[model samples]
Target: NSVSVDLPGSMKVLVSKSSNADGKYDLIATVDALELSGTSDKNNGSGVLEGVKADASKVKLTISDDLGQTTLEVFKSDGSTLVSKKVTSKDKVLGDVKFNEKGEVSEKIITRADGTRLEYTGIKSDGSGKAKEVLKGYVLEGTLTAEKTTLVVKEGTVTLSKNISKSGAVSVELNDTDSSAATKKTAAWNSGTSTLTITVNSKKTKDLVFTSSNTITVQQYDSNGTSLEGSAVEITKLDEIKNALK
Candidate 1:
């Protein structure tokens, strides 16, 4: 079956024939190549691209289709490895493939029109990673917004800049996708006490005490450090979290 792309961004495509009666597609200018944003933004109202930070020169695009299956792949800066991929059946998009900066498949996400999201994560096998469909969960559309990202791409399936810090962090802040708005959260972790504190938009939320080996306590506090009920206790979920930091 014949196929064509609807084209996602303002990237211009120039088609012409060569002197030798051969069709040559020159991919040199920024406007000449097919482009895509870093995140899902079909619902955006501003008509702006949120995640096209890669220099036009650093990216390469390839498209191929057979029957109703069409694959769109974006190569890395060197034009050797794949960073992100999208598979579509005609006009309908299936889902996306995502690779983290760690040189591994962190997860892949499937999205719905109503903001219903699902995550399919594979378990780590033999150290070097790729999800194997052992984990499943529900996510929110807010978590997939590109406005909250740091312009990092999965090209070659990894991060552009390594997240290595020379010093310890006093506090951590990042996009809060669970909020369903353009927002972020702050976090503080203490190794000496194994206490994790969370603050959402300047309001203290709760503190997690991994002080015990098995059972953990999550106690909430008011803005002024007053009683805020809901001192919940959860057990049997610390093996992974503790090992991750260690």
Candidate 2:
């Protein structure tokens, strides 16, 4: 129920004229309680003006857990909301929920200050009540090449080369011959260019995708998908794909 109560004495008026949250407050004002009563003019006295000047003078803390998320809000004795913030084990706000085709909350999408976003498939806490790990949802910006792997991306065609570790800090592999080194290329023998994405499958096989006028997808280390038995590290970029690759 929407309950309305008259504020006694001087009250702290919420900066929000409407119930809508700005989420941009300086966080100093004690603004948790004044409800809208037309232009915030009260029946009794000029307490609204008096309350405005005494900003941050007082605050009442509130903690709530809803939808498995925790929130902390501060209020004024006069009943206006002061500061509302989400408190998490990560010390960051759990953002919007992404629903899948099945209408399930697939992941929590948190837009980082950067253009990318964080995807939490599920959230859990430790026995100590702290939260758990989150999957990487952000797109990596760097195209990498070094160590056991190297990427060759040109035009839109792509080539991945991985060498067996021969010794500490050094490794080598051969190519093109009948008994060639491990190499994989696109099936369609694709071309053209855009921001390409590379990923590996269960077989530790790698694939690259280019979304453009001509779509190009690379990799499958083998036909039936049975690839090398090993682990792989994600490299940031490749070679000759411009400064963006490096």
Clashes of each: 5, 17
Candidate 1 has its poorest 10 consecutive residues by lDDT at 157-166
Candidate 2 lDDT (Cα, 0 to 1): 0.29
lDDT of 1 by residue, 182-206 (tens): 2234556665665656565565566
Off by over 4 Å in 2: 1-60, 64-70, 74-83, 89-225, 235-246
TM-score of 1: 0.30
Q: Candidate 1 vs. truth: CA RMSD?
A: 18.3
Error of 1 at 32 (Å): 12
* Model number with the top TM-score: 1
Taking the tens digit of each residue's C-alpha lDDT, what string does model 2 give over 1-246?
A: 122222221222233322324322111123344322222222211112223224553223222212122233333445453332223323333445433333334344454323233334432221011111121331312111222222222332333332212131222111222222243322221233222223222233433434221122343345345552233233333332222111
